[PDB]
Amino acid sequence: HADQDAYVADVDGILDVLRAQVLERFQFISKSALSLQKDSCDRINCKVKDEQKSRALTIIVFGASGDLAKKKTFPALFDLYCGGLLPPEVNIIGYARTKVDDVEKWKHETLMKYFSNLSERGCHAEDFLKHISYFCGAYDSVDDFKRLDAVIREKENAFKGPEKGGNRLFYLALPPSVFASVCESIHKGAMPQEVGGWVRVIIEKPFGRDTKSSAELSQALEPFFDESQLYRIDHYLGKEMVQNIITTRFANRIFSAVWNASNIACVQITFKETIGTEGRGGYFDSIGIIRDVMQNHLTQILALLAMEKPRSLDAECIRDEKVSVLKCIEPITKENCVLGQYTASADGSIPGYLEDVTVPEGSTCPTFAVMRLNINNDRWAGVPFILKAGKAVEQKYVAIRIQFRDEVHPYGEATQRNELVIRAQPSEAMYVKITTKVPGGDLRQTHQTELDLTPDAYESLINDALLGNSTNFVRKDELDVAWRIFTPLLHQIDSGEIKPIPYQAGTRGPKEADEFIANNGFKHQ
């Protein structure tokens, strides 16, 4: 309805007129309201901001000798350095349990092995290692964090610059079981100095495995770090796609006006991988495809896509809207879910999921899921939202597909449903499919045409955290709502009330899934 969007715009335009009147200094808002009634391996070029330059900065990577830290975090930090997005005087500390004598060989052997050895980057590796130190320490001794504090205080007091104190980003590349321990230890032991500096904490998934376990972690952490400080990171959600979702829609009347039940026939969000899970049963078997990427990754995409209009692009305004729309979503039913589990590829190259020492025999863990979500609000009531995720399928692909309702009249078969695709993998692309004339010479001689409207994902998130921008991080309330959307389903699945269909590695998945989709409003182009 034009009136749904008009009313919001009228409220915002009233709050806007109470803005430029209150620009002349609660009780004044009440009075004004009734009143309105009556009417090449080159040099790193530093792209960092002034404030970023102005105070010291230490990044502490905890669990620095783990696979995530050494293969993912440190390389990501390296790429940001090469991109000129770390402050000049950035200090990095790898905190970990094991004692190390030859500090410099550890950086070279545990860390540099994994750096991007590309042309434009390789030459900067040694430069980056200068900014790194090692810290031997455990994740609970108050002593160890007192010592670390003093190690940081020395580097911060050495900073050659205008502001005192130090900004501190604690990056917990650890198993969630130690999050609370470390967090309290930081709180008691190693917060930024009184004089100045912010404190930020990046934590890694899993964020529980259901409503109850997730809220226990939130409760454990919330004594020590609030939602301005805590950053729950989703490696796979990048700047590029988020901007495509938000900007393309909210900046433009044309897309804004059609982004609703009256115009949209159906929406799919798809996350497909050719890779399987081989030798990862130790993580995956207990998690399943749904907890792994759908409850966390796909649902945040969905929230950004479905949300109502925030009043501004301030992060918490957007996060507020993510929560509101998630709260409109009905808990997913077992009647709206098709599950799969992959067997060996027909060509015998790829082994099945159960064919794995790190997977328990008999496992019914799903590697594939397609489900329908109902968003019960004025904007979305009736519209099918399809989430689809799967391992060992036919191609690597992440995209949003919005199919618009057909204009049957008057072009009939000389036209076709409009679409909007926002694709992130294997490469970024955003387009609309529309119908246009061909130059020749009758009106029903039409064409299908694709208007193109167009640091990696993980890196862009670490950068956002340094910048203090939490837009693309799940907030504590948001996380809780998301868990309530999926947990009843996850229970039904673990109680065996629905079961995975087998599919061979390299196919599309269970044929049943494609029938589900087609039976839930999608029409083939």
Ligand X SMILES: N[C@@H]1[C@@H](O)[C@H](O)[C@@H](COP(=O)(O)O)O[C@@H]1O
Residues of this chain that interact with ligand X (CB under 6 A) are: 236-238, 240-241, 301, 398, 424-425, 457
Under the binding rule (CB under 8 A), the answer on residue 16 touching its own copies is yes
Rounded to the nearest whole angstrom, what is the least distance from the CB of residue 34 to its own copies in the complex? Answer: 5
Give the one entry of ligand X, its own copies, none that residue 40 binds, where binding means its C-beta sits below a cut-off of 5 to 8 angstroms depending on kind.
none
Q: How many residues does the chain have?
A: 525
Rounded to the nearest whole angstrom, what is the least distance from the CB of residue 310 to its own copies in the complex? Answer: 9
**Residue 373 to residue 381: CA distance in whole angstroms:** 11
How many residues form the binding site for its own copies (CB under 8 A)?
Answer: 42
Give the one entry of its own copies, ligand X, none that residue 41 binds, where binding means its C-beta sits below a cut-off of 5 to 8 angstroms depending on kind.
none
Residues 414 and 446 sit within 8 Å (Cβ to Cβ):
yes
Return the closest-CA partner of residue 93 out of 156, 48, 179: 156
Rounded to the nearest whole angstrom, what is the least distance from the CB of residue 470 to ligand X in the complex? Answer: 16
Give the one entry of its own copies, ligand X, none that residue 11 binds, where binding means its C-beta sits below a cut-off of 5 to 8 angstroms depending on kind.
its own copies
Q: Are strands 199-203 and 230-232 parallel, antiparallel or unpaired?
A: parallel
Give the one entry of its own copies, ligand X, none that residue 241 binds, where binding means its C-beta sits below a cut-off of 5 to 8 angstroms depending on kind.
ligand X
**Residue 345 to residue 479: CA distance in whole angstroms:** 36
The residue among 75 and 238 lying less far from ligand X, judged by its C-beta, is 238
Residues designated catalytic: 297
Q: Which of residues 255-294 bind its own copies (CB under 8 A)?
A: none
**Residue 6 to residue 483: CA distance in whole angstroms:** 33
Q: Which of residues 304-333 bind its own copies (CB under 8 A)?
A: 308, 311-312, 317, 320
Under the binding rule (CB under 8 A), the answer on residue 344 touching its own copies is yes
Among 187, 209, 235, 484, binds its own copies (CB under 8 A): 484
Rounded to the nearest whole angstrom, what is the least distance from the CB of residue 241 to ligand X in the complex? Answer: 3
Under the binding rule (CB under 8 A), the answer on residue 494 touching its own copies is no
219-238 footprint of its own copies as x/- string (CB under 8 A) = x-------------------
Give the one entry of its own copies, ligand X, none that residue 409 binds, where binding means its C-beta sits below a cut-off of 5 to 8 angstroms depending on kind.
none
The residue among 7 and 283 lying less far from its own copies, judged by its C-beta, is 7
Return the closest-CA partner of residue 202 out of 56, 61, 91: 61
Give the one entry of ligand X, its own copies, none that residue 194 binds, where binding means its C-beta sits below a cut-off of 5 to 8 angstroms depending on kind.
none
Under the binding rule (CB under 8 A), the answer on residue 205 touching its own copies is no
Give the one entry of its own copies, ligand X, none that residue 311 binds, where binding means its C-beta sits below a cut-off of 5 to 8 angstroms depending on kind.
its own copies
Rounded to the nearest whole angstrom, what is the least distance from the CB of residue 226 to its own copies in the complex? Answer: 16
**Residue 194 to residue 177: CA distance in whole angstroms:** 30
The residue among 315 and 402 lying less far from its own copies, judged by its C-beta, is 315
Rounded to the nearest whole angstrom, what is the least distance from the CB of residue 32 to its own copies in the complex? Answer: 9
Cβ-Cβ contacts under 8 Å for 208 (sequence gap 6 or more): 214, 215, 216, 217, 483
Give the one entry of its own copies, ligand X, none that residue 211 binds, where binding means its C-beta sits below a cut-off of 5 to 8 angstroms depending on kind.
its own copies
The residue among 241 and 466 lying less far from ligand X, judged by its C-beta, is 241
The residue among 267 and 424 lying less far from ligand X, judged by its C-beta, is 424
Rounded to the nearest whole angstrom, what is the least distance from the CB of residue 81 to its own copies in the complex? Answer: 30
The residue among 325 and 424 lying less far from ligand X, judged by its C-beta, is 424
The residue among 168 and 239 lying less far from ligand X, judged by its C-beta, is 239
Report the greatest alpha carbon distance in the chain.
84
Return the closest-CA partner of residue 185 out of 137, 226, 123, 245: 137
Return the closest-CA partner of residue 56 out of 154, 138, 165: 165
DSSP 22-87: GGG--HHHHHHHHHHH----PPP-----HHHHHSEEEEEEETTTSHHIIIIIHHHHHHHHHTT-S-
Place of tokens 């919005």: 402
Give the one entry of its own copies, ligand X, none that residue 1 binds, where binding means its C-beta sits below a cut-off of 5 to 8 angstroms depending on kind.
none
Q: ∠ CA 215-217-220 to the nearest 5 degrees? A: 110
Mapping DSSP onto H, E and C, the string for 318-356 reads HHHHHHHHHCCECCCCHHHEEEEEEECCCCCCCCCCCCC
Under the binding rule (CB under 8 A), the answer on residue 20 touching its own copies is yes
Residue 159 CA, distance from chain mean position = 33
Rounded to the nearest whole angstrom, what is the least distance from the CB of residue 498 to ligand X in the complex? Answer: 26
The residue among 293 and 434 lying less far from ligand X, judged by its C-beta, is 293
User: 3-class SS at 316?
Assistant: helix
Give the one entry of its own copies, ligand X, none that residue 236 binds, where binding means its C-beta sits below a cut-off of 5 to 8 angstroms depending on kind.
ligand X
Indicate the burial class of 102 (C-beta count within 10 angstroms; 0-12, 13-18, 19 or more).
exposed
Residues 297 and 424 sit within 8 Å (Cβ to Cβ):
no
Under the binding rule (CB under 8 A), the answer on residue 346 touching its own copies is yes
Under the binding rule (CB under 8 A), the answer on residue 499 touching its own copies is no
**Residue 165 to residue 157: CA distance in whole angstroms:** 7
The residue among 77 and 457 lying less far from ligand X, judged by its C-beta, is 457
Q: Please identify, among the stretches 21-29, 108-116, 276-284, 289-297, the one whose residues bind its own copies according to the rule CB under 8 A.
A: 21-29
Under the binding rule (CB under 8 A), the answer on residue 11 touching its own copies is yes
Cβ-Cβ contacts under 8 Å for 317 (sequence gap 6 or more): 310, 311
DSSP 491-520: HHHHTTSS-PEEEETTS-S-HHHHHHHHTT
Residues 389 and 271 sit within 8 Å (Cβ to Cβ):
yes
**Residue 365 to residue 352: CA distance in whole angstroms:** 12
List residues near its own copies by CB under 8 A.
Answer: 7-8, 10-12, 14-16, 18-20, 22-23, 26-27, 29-31, 33-34, 36-37, 211-216, 219, 308, 311-312, 317, 320, 344, 346-349, 480, 484, 487
